[PDB]
Every structure is written in C-alpha cells, then in structure tokens.
Ligand binder design. Structure first.
Ligand code: NA
Length: 605
C-alpha cells in the first residue's frame, strides 16, 4: 500500500484508492545532508482527478479534507488544542497544494500551508489565504526530516476511487549566511514570505503589483521531484496571510509590531526561548501595557479615564492588582501608553464591526490576518473568511523611501543622518513613484518611529467624532505646536518631538477637498458631508479648512487614506531648549520650502 510521491508523481501518477489508504515517505533528511544549514523547505504537488473527495495527512495530526466545496486544514499546535482552517473553493478542477517548513535551531516555530486553484491552462485562477500555524514541536522536526503522506478517498457519489497527482516535488532555499535572526526571518509573517521561493515570486509580483525587492543571492535547489511554477493573470487582489499564535496574544503582538516596528515573527513562538532581552526598550513595555489593560477587563471606551487617573496619581491604587500594575506601567512611559493603548483600542473597535460576537475578549486572542494591498488601487478588500481575525493592511511605509545612507533615527537632539540632500533624493523618488506632498505632521518621538518605520495606523479618537483622521498642516509652524510630548514622562521631563512630511498617492488628488468654514462648526458636519458625498467620518478623502475662524489651515486625512500615506522626516528640527516655543522661521531650510508646494484642493460650488 506504499508509493514514492517524488519518483512516480514528479511528472504524473494515478494512485488506486479502492483498497483504502496509500502512504509515501517524504525523507528530506537524506537529500538535505548533515549541514545544509538554516532555510525553507517548499513541498508542492498538483491534485487532479480524485482531488475533490480526499483526506490527506501531511504528518501526525496535520490533516487536509477536500469535499469539492471546501479545503479544510486540521493541525495539532504548541498551544491549548488543535485548530481548523476552512477555505471555500472559488473554482472547480485542478489545484496546487503548497507547504513551507522552516529548517534550523533559530528558525520560526510555524509552517505555511496554502492552496492555488488552477484553470484549463494550468494558470492560478484563485488563491487561498497563506495559513500560518504554530504546530507542535513534533510536527516542526518531522516535517523537516522524514514525514509520511497518507492518502484516503472519502465516499461521495463518484464511482471511481483514484487520485491523479502531477508536478510533485520539494525545493530548499538556504538562508543567506549573514544578518541577525530577527532580520533573516522578518518577512516570515508578511505577504513577502512568497518572495523567498523563485517558484512563487510571479504570484506575489502580479497580485500585489509590487516587486519582491528578500534574501539576495538565494538559490531554489530542487531536492526531489519536479515542482511546477504556475503563471497567473488574476486581476490585482489582496494576498491574505492568517497568523495563528500558540500563546493566544494576537492583539498584544500586532500592536507591539505596529508601535515598535518589530517584525511580527520576532513576537511569535520561539523554538529557543530567549526572553525580552533583544526587545526590552519598546517590545516588552508596549506588549506589557496591552496585556495589562486586557487583564483588567475594562472596556477600551474608558482608556482616556484610565490614563488621566494614572497620571494624576491622586486616587489610592493597590499596586498588587492588575488595575494598579496598568497604572504603574502608564506612569513608567506615558508617551507609548497613549500611542500603544489608543492603537489597540482602534484595532479592537474595527474588529468588533467585522461580524457579530467580535467582543473585546475575542479580539485579545484572535488570529492576525495580514493583507498585501495591491499597488495603484486605493481599495484593499479583505476576503470574507477573515471576519473572525484582527486585520492589518500592509502598505509601503516611509522607511522604504529614505534612500541610501546610515540608519535614520529620532532623538531630542535632532533626526540622525537626515540631510537636506537625502530629503531631496527621497522627495524626487516619491514624486516618480506617484505620490504628492499634503503637508507636515508634528508628533512625539515614539509615534514618529512607528509612522516612518512601520506606517500610519489608526488610533482611537472617539471623543472628537465625527472628525477622526490623521491631522496634517500645510504650514510647518502649525504642525510644530504638536511636535512634542503631551505631558511629563516618569523622570518629569517634556521632550521636543519631530516634524514629518506626509505624502498620499496621486490617485487621491480628486478627493482632497477644502472649505472656508471652521472644521468643528455647527453646519460644518453636514456641509462637509455633502461636499464629500457621504456623512463623516472621512474615508478615502481629506478635508482642508480653518482650525479656528481666521485661524491657520488644518488637513484631516481619512484613516483609510492615511494608512496609504508615506511619511518621511522633515529637515526642520524641533528646538530642544524651547519646548512649547514657536517655530523659528529661519530654521526652515530654503531647499525644503521649495519642495513643499501643496496641491490645488477641490472646494464646494
Ligand atoms: Na505591519
């Protein structure tokens, strides 16, 4: 009842399933060798006739069930119990089974499984989410050395009990022998995991309309069989990447990733537990604030009262209680408490609107769906099967536009390695890649780091409804007033902040509106609502208008547009010795003024 998948099915095999179960050994341990090092195994095969009524076991307690309607994946985990993922087939006929298994002592503690539905031409017509599972330690070792593929027909109305496989094979990509582990595996929990395998590059490129510019010099070495590289002409669509966490700290992990610009794989399960030593300065404090808030079971709606009372420190607190520990954590770093808790609150809110029963409790331990948003498209639709997950939209960020030079970083003493020359180069690159400047954002140092090195993310602004959005000023003097801490840190000092330059995609230009009314006036809500063709809050639109009557101009980017903005540093410094003082007009370099022409905004007739 055995077979050789990689010898018989490398081209095309028809297996008899009439007498029950068929099994093949997937021995990669021999083919790899003693020390082929750290990297990624890519197993793949095409399932043809018989592939719509099957039970496959890719290992002990990893099962695939295909009934023609769904393809379901049941796995044992390193966590509390097994998990089930279910893909609704969008098409009919042949499909590609892919699974990625990392190799090495310091390699990620998850596998990838995903399905590509094929048309008559053997091109990809539909893709599943990339399912990322923190499997049992047993599966991590087994699926990387010697694993057994069991195949059983499951009874339906089909008279015949056979399975035709083609293009069965396993490739191995060796990780470039350089770089920290953090950097090596940084794309593991993004759309760009597909970029690590030559045979899946074209799929990432075509769907996203974005280049794979990971691991320069890598070689896709076929170990056995003949893996297929399928072309696709699918209309641009979002690549979904579902991330399971054995620890169940999805919301804490995503917020930590977004606040600290730490790759989400470094906050996943570790094979060799290492503690928080490598991530002690932003990682631990941010993760601890969100964990502690959730343990109090306070609603996110009460965030403003919780922070106000913690900073006042007038009320008597029990330092032993979760409520008291949260309050100490907030005093210990007010800046990142505001940034982190407000970002977690907005994510919990968006999650609760996705479907019924998406409570605060469920958001805390939900999976994360990462979405690779197609370039040259202002709409990034998540697939319906992601309603039960925390959703992160990956768009290009400021970090990818900084050009060549030493590491840009933020401090009270000024922005490091950010010359008038480097900004000019970055600006030209942004204009050439279809962006335009809409003004200045002033903020505190930790917010600047998040916005540039990770990207703009929605923060809870429920108190100012319906005027939620990313606030920008054409005049840097207005932004400057906000480029500082809102209150004293634990050491009792208020720090100067950072001025940032905000760029939106050129396609948004039609929906950048202006008005001569004050942006929180009586009739203004309804007058702006008619101007943008729907009620506030703003979506894929901006509004520019006087902040006060006779005041300077404020620009509000709707959060759905703001997330697609690219933000880079200004060369306009904040004054470390005049914190609360006005911008010195003499400190604005002529070379930055010259590239800061605002676009012509659309007004009411
Ligand atoms: Na992200």
């Amino acid at each position: 009842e055995s077979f050789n998948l990689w010898q018989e099915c490398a081209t095309r095999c028809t297996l008899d399933l009439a007498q029950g179960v068929r099994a093949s050994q997937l021995d990669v341990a021999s083919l790899l060798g003693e020390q082929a090092g750290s990297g990624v195994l890519h197993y793949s095969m095409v399932l043809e006739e018989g592939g719509d009524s099957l039970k496959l076991a890719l290992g002990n307690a990893l099962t695939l069930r295909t009934d023609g309607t769904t393809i379901t994946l049941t796995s044992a985990t390193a966590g509390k119990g097994p998990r089930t993922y279910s893909y609704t087939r969008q098409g009919r006929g042949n499909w590609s089974l892919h699974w990625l298994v990392p190799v090495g002592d310091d390699a990620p503690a998850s596998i990838k499984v995903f399905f590509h539905e094929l048309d008559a031409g053997s091109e990809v017509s539909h893709i599943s989410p990339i399912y990322s599972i923190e499997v049992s330690d047993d599966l991590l070792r087994t699926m990387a050395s010697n694993s057994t593929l069991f195949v059983r027909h499951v009874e339906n109305n089909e008279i015949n009990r056979s399975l035709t496989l083609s293009a069965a094979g396993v490739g191995f990509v060796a990780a470039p022998t350089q770089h920290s582990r953090q950097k090596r595996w940084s794309e593991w929990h993004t759309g760009k995991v597909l970029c690590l395998l030559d045979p899946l590059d074209a799929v990432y490129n075509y769907l996203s309309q974005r280049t794979c510019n990971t691991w320069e010099g890598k070689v896709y070495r076929v170990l056995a069989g003949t893996p297929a590289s399928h072309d696709t002409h699918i209309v641009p669509t979002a690549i979904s990447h579902r991330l399971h966490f054995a620890k169940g700290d999805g919301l804490a992990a995503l917020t930590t990733h977004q606040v600290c610009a730490i790759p989400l794989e470094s906050l996943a399960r570790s094979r060799q537990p290492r503690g928080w030593e490598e991530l002690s300065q932003c990682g631990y404090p941010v993760h601890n604030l969100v964990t502690l808030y959730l343990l109090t079971r306070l609603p996110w709606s009460q965030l403003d009262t919780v922070i106000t009372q913690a900073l006042a420190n007038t009320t008597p607190e029990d330092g032993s209680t979760p409520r008291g520990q949260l309050a100490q954590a907030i005093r210990e770093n007010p800046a990142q408490a505001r940034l982190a808790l407000s970002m977690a609150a907005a994510q919990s809110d968006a999650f609760s609107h996705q479907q019924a029963g998406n409570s605060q409790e469920q958001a805390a331990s939900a999976d994360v769906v990462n979405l690779t948003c197609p370039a040259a498209d202002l709409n990034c639709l998540a697939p319906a099967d992601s309603a039960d997950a925390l959703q992160e939209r990956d768009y290009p960020n400021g970090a990818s536009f900084l050009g060549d030079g030493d590491e840009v970083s933020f401090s009270t003493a000024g922005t490091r390695n950010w010359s008038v020359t480097r900004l000019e180069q970055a600006h030209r690159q942004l204009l050439a890649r279809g962006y335009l400047f809409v003004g200045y954002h002033g903020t505190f140092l930790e917010a600047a780091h998040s916005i540039v090195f990770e990207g703009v993310h929605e923060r809870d602004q429920s108190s100012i409804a319906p005027w939620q959005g990313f606030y920008v000023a054409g005049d840097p003097a207005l932004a400057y007033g906000y480029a500082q801490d809102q209150e004293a840190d634990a050491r009792g000092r208020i720090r100067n902040g950072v001025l940032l330059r905000v760029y939106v995609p050129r396609a948004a230009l039609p929906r950048l509106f202006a008005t001569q009314q004050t942006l929180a006036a009586p009739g203004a809500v309804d007058e702006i609502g008619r101007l943008i063709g729907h009620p506030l809050p703003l979506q894929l639109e901006a509004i520019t208008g006087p902040e006060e009557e006779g005041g300077r101009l404020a620009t509000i980017l709707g959060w759905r547009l703001a997330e697609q903005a690219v933000v880079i540093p200004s060369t306009i410094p904040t004054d470390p010795r005049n914190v609360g003082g006005d911008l010195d007009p003499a400190s604005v370099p002529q070379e930055e003024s010259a590239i800061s022409t605002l676009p012509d905004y659309t007004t009411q007739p």
